[PDB]
Ligand binder design. Structure first.
Ligand SMILES: Nc1ncnc2c1ncn2[C@@H]1O[C@H](COP(=O)(O)OP(=O)(O)OP(=O)(O)O)[C@@H](O)[C@H]1O
Ligand SMILES: Nc1ncnc2c1ncn2[C@@H]1O[C@H](COP(=O)(O)OP(=O)(O)OP(=O)(O)O)[C@@H](O)[C@H]1O
Ligand SMILES: Nc1nc2nccnc2c(=O)[nH]1
Ligand SMILES: Nc1nc2nccnc2c(=O)[nH]1
Ligand SMILES: [Ca+2]
Ligand SMILES: [Ca+2]
Ligand SMILES: [Mg+2]
Ligand SMILES: [Mg+2]
Lengths: 590, 543
């Protein structure tokens, strides 16, 4: 109509699916699309995990330069933080929204038409008998007037991304039920829709789109039929119930899982893997316990009683940790008055940035696996300098971004996302030991972290880039740090980052030599024993963490910890999973 | 009569030994084992010790025992004909005591059973079975000797006759004339603190005789013991074999009360003189290789390891001067230093168990004669000189033994690496060695298994043995991984003291694995480091 172009200031809620077949580049492609959605469609306000899925039965330098020559949007990009989105709440509850521009169909008619598509598609795949999928859902607060307009823009975005490569579907658009059977749009109509949203500069693209939209189905035809879609939606909007559905997303999800089990004896989760991202690569949730080596610049420079920072010593230590098998380095410093009068002082920034810059330089000078760099800071300005100068990959925020929530804006650039660790604590090092009463220790901390993740996700931080840290020793008695470990299973769905290394609660476990503690100043014989015991105690927690599938463990003793993980991994590497009962029967037989 | 007939007879008896005293269970049951070896015949099978739910005079006792009239022969045996006969119900000679048939036995047993069920309306047991090749003529004579044994030791112990050959006997209203008891006893024992007043107690104590024991098939603890020793055995008076009766009793208890009767009934092994519950603690065995060197230095190292948390010390002088010269003096100095440090007498609890890593008869013999050790760690599983098995027993002492699997010697072993079914070849071998010692009278509960990591195994074979350590879930298990090459083989490449530290840490990983697999003992050089790991994992486990 003309209503499609009738420029009333609408605010709409759309749910999208983003999928690619390209394994090695799945992150780059999917995040590229995320940026294009954020630029051309509205605000990203929810995301699912990334998933590698198996079905029911390229030279990427193009992308990099594509990103520098993009047409401006006709809508303002706004990075401002939000703590709620009223239209999102309305969508979630089916609160009364404005009637659909496009004509709607009734439920029954909708169901029949979708079934027709599924049957027809099922049959074609039989004849066609002459691969991994990567999937991500997003909720978008959109300024686009209707799903046909949005699909038009989506189709434009897909074309921009071509030199399936990328597939962007619309799953929901408000509470609308729509099935438009025959769609041919003339080139000028596509132009005018595109022109309503983009400052169009270019004509090669339009042509390819003309035939590419045969029909429009909202909800997407496959919404309830493809497990991988249910799986993603279940991360984002588990309590959502659309009119066309028999139950909530969560109930539909659980029924699919349980019926796959009851009826086909298939565990559908086994072949559909949750992914998290540390830097720019896929990591499979719960498949690997990574080592994060600790670089505390204060300790490294000043614990011997010296007064100067030694950046070359610090960078050397970093190379040592890389050689010892750390996958990640966590660097931190604190503003410090190093005399007896504490007023002449060196800043956090001067502690860590020069070290990071010398590391970057020294790494570059050896092109003859770069470790992921994490920075343990709560300070906006420090993180901004690091990120602007490409010195770090991950924010490690021990306040869970409550010290300065604005730091969260630094985790998204135009063509980049950064991962973040959120830790639980109460207070600071001076007060925390007293801040120890919890109503329900395990669940208070979990609920705390979940609420922070909900806040970041609302602000367009991708769900799969957010890691949880329970903060061992930070406002927990020794027995409570243990109890948190005893109940580490409550994090089985989440990327988990823990730090037990050299903490007092380990010594609290002890009763009544090749030294693992490199002394900075001479300690008495009993303290050397205590340190050695503490480091071995933590190697015990490394083993536990291995068996509990903790994703990252943050340690001072990298060599020791890697030796433990290598042996446990080797003992787990079972060549034949049936051998043990097969060999058993054979011995009973012979 | 025909009761005291001069005929030299060889029978098979199956005994149950029971006590209520947890603190002294071992000393009491083993005292009884010794008295059974002395007064009844030869022990050729034993069960584990069990804890189930339904002292300074004893040492003195053993000094002034009256002598048996029968020989004690220690030569090793490979087989026992009469036992084979008993196991398969072959033909034996007629019972000199009158038998009853199945129906009558069952009837008379029911009567005892119900009459005892009545006597409820009107907590800890320690159990062990033994198979005895006996010179005693008949089960009634045997019961007389048994009652004597019980009086010598005295409530503190109950010794029942479970089986005696293939016989089915139910004699009621036994009255034994005071002079017959003396006469039966004198036929087996040179009768000369107790005079003849003991015989007075016994006269009332035999009221009837049931073979099989009335409760044989009715108490779980008896079935549990018998299943260890003779699972294929089927007496005429029984529905099926020991094993089936055992399995079908477990099955009843769970599908009729949701009990799972293994929660109350614990298999026990013994390292020295105390009860150890199988699979309930991972003990550390500290390694002292004397091959370090000087007595004083070596002995201070022993004290160092005790304080670091070792329950056991394993000393060896084998991987110029002799093995004997390396180890004996060290163990002598240890024993002296131990006894001096009785300034704190209260820590008589804190004496480490001592294990000697030898295959040399002469070395073990000197250790045992001088009370210098508790355990034989025989890396040949006692195949190098089986005569050493004779040293695992004294008149008032049993020693425990670790049996390890290897092939060849230190020069040849790396080449003897082919196995048809590695995990089960090694396990069956160990079971064969155990059967051999058990047949020779070594209590089953004192025998520990060791897979011999690194001895005739390639690195992947050592790992594979660890992966399948669950096959030892029923056995006391002792392993030594410490500082072995297979650990270093797991390390992913990416200087000497580097490899050394990786290896020590790689072993702490195996300590953790062993903790979770419930390995009973682990043999390590780095005692402090290992103890730290175990304390943490134990703390995590305690809710
Ligand atoms: N909600 C929707 N989102 C995206 N495409 C849709 C939707 N409803 C219908 N379509 C139609 O489906 C076709 C899109 O196919 P696409 O190229 O995305 O791969 P596909 O898997 O073959 O299709 P589909 O997205 O329907 O599964 C187009 O013709 C488009 O009009
Ligand atoms: N096979 C047997 N072994 C031991 N005692 C037996 C046997 N058959 C019958 N008895 C009789 O049972 C009594 C054994 O006394 P004991 O101290 O063992 O108490 P108990 O355990 O209650 O008896 P029982 O062992 O018969 O159940 C004696 O009177 C003994 O004659
Ligand atoms: N995220 C995180 N950071 C830390 N920084 C210092 C000490 N412990 C920790 C810790 O346990 N977790
Ligand atoms: N029982 C035993 N003894 C040993 N002696 C030396 C080296 N390894 C071992 C070992 O693994 N087990
Ligand atoms: Ca935007
Ligand atoms: Ca004997
Ligand atoms: Mg599609
Ligand atoms: Mg009795």
């Amino acid at each position: 109509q003309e209503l499609i172009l009738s420029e009333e200031n609408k605010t709409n809620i759309a749910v999208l699916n983003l999928g690619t077949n390209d394994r090695r580049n799945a992150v780059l492609i999917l995040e590229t699309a995320l940026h294009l959605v954020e630029k051309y469609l509205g605000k990203i306000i929810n995301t699912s995990y990334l998933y590698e899925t198996v079905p029911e039965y390229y030279d990427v330098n193009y992308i990099n330069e594509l990103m520098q020559n993009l047409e401006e949007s006709k809508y303002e990009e706004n990075k401002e933080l939000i703590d709620k989105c009223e239209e999102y709440e309305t969508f979630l509850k089916n609160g009364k929204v404005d009637n659909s521009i496009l004509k709607e169909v009734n439920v029954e008619n909708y169901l029949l038409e979708c079934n027709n598509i599924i049957v027809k598609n099922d049959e074609i795949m039989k004849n066609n008998l002459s691969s991994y999928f990567y999937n991500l859902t997003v909720v978008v607060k959109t300024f686009v007037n209707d799903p046909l307009s949005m699909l038009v823009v989506i189709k434009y975005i897909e074309e921009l991304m071509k030199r399936r490569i990328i597939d962007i579907d619309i799953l929901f658009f408000n509470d609308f039920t729509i099935f438009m059977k025959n769609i041919k749009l003339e080139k000028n109509m596509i132009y005018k829709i595109l022109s309503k949203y983009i400052h169009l500069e270019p004509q090669e693209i339009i042509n390819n789109m003309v035939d590419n939209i045969e029909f429009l189905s909202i909800p997407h035809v496959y919404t309830t039929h493809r497990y991988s879609i249910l799986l993603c939606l279940n991360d984002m909007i588990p309590e959502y119930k659309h009119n066309v559905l028999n139950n909530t997303i969560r109930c539909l999800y659980n029924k699919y899982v349980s019926r796959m089990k009851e009826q086909y004896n298939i565990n559908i989760k086994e072949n559909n893997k949750r992914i998290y991202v540390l830097k720019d690569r896929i990591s499979y949730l719960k498949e690997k316990t990574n080592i994060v080596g600790i670089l505390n610049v204060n300790y490294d420079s000043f614990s011997d009683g010296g007064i100067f920072v030694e950046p070359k010593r610090a960078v050397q230590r970093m190379f040592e940790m890389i050689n010892e098998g750390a996958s990640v380095i966590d660097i931190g410093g604190e503003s410090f008055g190093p005399f007896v009068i504490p007023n002449p002082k060196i800043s956090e920034r001067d502690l860590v940035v020069p070290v990071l810059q010398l590391f970057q330089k020294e790494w570059n000078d050896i092109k003859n696996a770069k470790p992921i760099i994490s920075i343990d800071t709560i300070n906006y300005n420090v993180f901004k300098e690091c990120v602007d100068n490409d010195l770090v990959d991950i924010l490690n925020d021990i306040s869970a971004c409550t010290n300065n929530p604005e730091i969260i804006k630094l985790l998204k650039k135009k063509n980049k996302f950064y991962s973040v660790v959120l830790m639980h604590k109460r207070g600071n090092p001076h007060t925390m030991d007293k801040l120890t009463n919890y109503d329900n220790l395990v669940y208070d901390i979990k609920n705390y972290l979940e609420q922070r993740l909900n806040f970041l996700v609302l602000n367009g931080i991708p769900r799969y880039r957010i890691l949880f840290d329970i903060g061992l020793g930070f406002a927990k008695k020794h027995d409570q740090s243990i109890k948190l470990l005893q109940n580490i299973h409550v994090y089985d769905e989440y990327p988990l980052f823990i730090g037990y290394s050299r903490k007092r609660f380990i010594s609290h476990c002890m009763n009544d030599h090749n030294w693992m503690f490199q002394m900075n100043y001479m300690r008495k014989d009993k303290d050397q024993l205590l340190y050695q015991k503490n480091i071995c105690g933590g190697l015990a927690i490394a083993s536990y963490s291995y068996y509990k599938k903790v994703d990252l463990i943050r340690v001072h003793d990298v060599l020791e910890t890697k030796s433990v993980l290598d042996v446990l991994t080797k003992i787990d590497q079972v060549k034949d999973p049936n051998s043990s009962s097969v060999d058993k029967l054979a011995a009973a037989l012979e």
